[PDB]
Design a binder for this molecule. Structure first.
Ligand SMILES: CC(C)N(c1ccc(Oc2ccccc2C(F)(F)F)cc1C(=O)O)C(=O)[C@H]1CC[C@H](C)CC1
Ligand SMILES: [Mg+2]
Length: 559
């Protein structure tokens, strides 16, 4: 069937939309080519609509059905718990879209009478009505990028705040534990960046002669069929569930997940969806399971040897035993025709790779550098273009989520995150006296509140002390960063080194946690190195909850 059907009504914004980077005194210090940075808006919604609108073709075979059964057998060991209204409300982010039923996110978190009672009524309705298509709002997503040698806006589809809390009640526990139980070491969200690197590096070095590839599915959400969503539910149903959880899942599947009506910001009937909605709680889990199912069966059809895959939502990376240049190419091509028949056609054409560093998955790649003792250490990195573009936008405007804070956490070991992101933001925070002020960021889609001052501990626990001593990066990594800096008009190392030394001196004079930031975060900027020993508060953090599952679009907040 058609992924989408349009009534002709337009995808409208619910307020003025900013497209250009403001000429701000602070952003310009970070990036000078401001005309190269832009924010996607509803003005390009039509372009995206055309790309994501098409009739899906799907042909299922014995491999598909075989993998499906293997997955179900594992789901059969799970027991989900069903969250209480209160627990569910607590998972709602403070900046979550307000309900249209007389209350907002703050009211939800405060367990206000009007939020709870309405939420209760939406839940009773899921138990009683198993058919009526639940209403969804479709909006053009606002995302920042750097122009290329422009991306149309992404389309987000999400139901009312009331339905969102209900999703959590019924499926939060399911989407947090089932993926790992069914996919094992292949589920990527259970890994922190260092651990994802470990898994990739080990899988790679474990092969006699490794061959790997990333697989980009052209517009994955739209390739998701009604069959995929019901199959997905068949997996969730293998869990021991509370009677009401079971019914809620059944109802949500038929009324929300398989598809439903689309309404714009003006309340006008916009169209109908028969594919994956990006803004629901099961998106990440549903995409991971579906992508894992199709790719696993495709590998079997393609005769790829000793396949090892890692999956994160629609993102897929596979590593296997090479059978020779020619054979590998053919087998990969076969894998693709197999994924195509499963309604998962390729966007970027897949290509075999024999150099781990060149393999890009989850927009990142493994690279290597050396610690103070000259020891080789592998870490995760990525092209810094988008991160810096977004850092500049966030420097000019206030935003609910601060991608720069998340990028510093996830990419702490990198040359670019350390030299620029850390130097730039600590300079601003210290100048505005806001080092104590906790800010929100996202990790695997979930929103977290983090105090800039705890970064030292955090970084040590997640990456190890070597994160503060890496040097001698790969020429490939160095060429990519330098290339990025010239393009965006970012000041050279010498300038950052000077700003970093000043930032550090001030941080040290404040003592306490600030001084701790100055010592560890910016030791690279001084010649007279300091001895970096384990930080006491480090081995006392509870970061385990950070890497359990993906939640992008799931409207999740972790206190
Ligand atoms: C070796 C020395 C002195 N060095 C580097 C300085 C620049 C660099 O990258 C470049 C080299 C030449 C031109 C442009 C660049 C780039 F634009 F990429 F930075 C790479 C390295 C490194 O450790 O490999 C360092 O000590 C860095 C260690 C990490 C901090 C945070 C910045 C300084
Ligand atoms: Mg894709």
């Amino acid at each position: 069937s058609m992924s989408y059907t349009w009534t002709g009504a337009l995808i409208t914004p619910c307020a003025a939309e900013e497209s250009k980077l403001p000429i701000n005194p602070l952003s310009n210090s970070l990036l000078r080519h401001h005309n190269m940075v832009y924010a996607t808006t509803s003005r390009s919604a039509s372009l995206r609509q055309k790309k994501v609108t098409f009739d899906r073709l799907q042909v299922l075979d014995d491999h598909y059905r075989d993998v499906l059964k293997e997955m179900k057998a594992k789901a059969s060991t799970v027991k989900a718990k069903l969250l209480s209204i209160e627990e569910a409300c607590k998972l709602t982010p403070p900046h979550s879209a307000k309900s249209k039923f007389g209350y907002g996110a703050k009211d939800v978190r405060n367990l206000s009478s009007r939020a709870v009672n309405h939420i209760r009524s939406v839940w009773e309705d899921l138990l009683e009505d198993t058919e009526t298509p639940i209403d969804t709002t479709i909006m053009a997503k606002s995302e920042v990028f750097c122009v290329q040698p422009r991306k149309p806006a992404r389309l987000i589809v999400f139901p009312d705040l009331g339905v969102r809390v209900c999703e959590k009640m019924a499926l939060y526990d399911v989407v947090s534990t089932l993926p790992q139980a069914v996919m094992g070491s292949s589920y990527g969200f259970q890994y922190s960046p260092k651990q994802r690197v470990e898994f990739l590096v080990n899988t790679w070095k474990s092969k006699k002669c490794p061959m790997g590839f990333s697989y980009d599915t052209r517009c994955f959400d739209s390739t998701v069929t009604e069959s995929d969503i019901r199959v997905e539910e068949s997996i969730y149903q293998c869990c021991d569930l509370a009677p009401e959880a079971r019914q809620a899942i059944r109802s949500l599947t038929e009324r929300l997940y398989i598809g439903g009506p689309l309404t714009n910001s003006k309340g006008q009937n916009c169209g109908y969806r028969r594919c994956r909605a990006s803004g629901v709680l099961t998106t990440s889990c549903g995409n991971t399971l579906t992508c894992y199912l199709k790719a696993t069966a495709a590998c079997r059809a393609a005769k790829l040897q000793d396949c090892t895959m890692l999956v994160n939502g629609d993102d897929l990376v596979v590593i296997c035993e090479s059978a020779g240049t020619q054979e590998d190419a053919a087998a990969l091509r076969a894998f693709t025709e197999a994924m195509t028949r499963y309604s998962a056609p390729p966007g970027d054409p897949p290509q075999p790779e024999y150099d781990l560093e060149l393999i890009t998955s989850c927009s990142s790649n493994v690279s290597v550098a050396h610690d103070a003792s000259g020891k080789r250490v592998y870490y995760l990195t990525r092209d810094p273009t988008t991160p810096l573009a977004r850092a500049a936008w966030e420097t000019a405007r206030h935003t609910p989520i601060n991608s720069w804070l998340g990028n510093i956490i996830m990419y702490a070991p990198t040359l670019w995150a350390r030299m620029i992101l850390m130097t730039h933001f600590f300079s601003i925070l210290l100048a505005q006296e806001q080092l104590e002020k906790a800010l929100d960021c996202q990790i695997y889609g979930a929103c977290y509140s983090i105090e800039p001052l705890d970064l030292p501990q955090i970084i040590e626990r997640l990456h190890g002390l070597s994160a503060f001593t890496l040097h001698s990066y790969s020429p490939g990594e160095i060429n990519r960063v330098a290339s990025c800096l010239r393009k965006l008009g970012v000041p050279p190392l010498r300038t950052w080194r000077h700003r970093a030394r000043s930032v550090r001196a001030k941080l040290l004079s404040q003592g306490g946690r600030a001084a701790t930031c100055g010592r560890y975060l910016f030791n690279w900027a001084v010649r007279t190195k300091l001895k970096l020993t384990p930080i006491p508060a480090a081995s006392q953090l509870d970061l385990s909850g950070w890497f359990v599952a993906g939640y992008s679009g799931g409207d999740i907040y972790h206190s």
